[PDB]
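Could you help me review a protein record that somebody else here produced? My question to you is simply how this chain folds and whether the tokens agree. Thanks in advance; the entry in question is below:
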Amino acid sequence: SLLVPSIIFILAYSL
């Protein structure tokens, strides 16, 4: 997984 996946979403801030 839930986290490992989450960290990604937030990454979208890059983009």
Summary: The two ends are 23 Å apart (CA to CA).
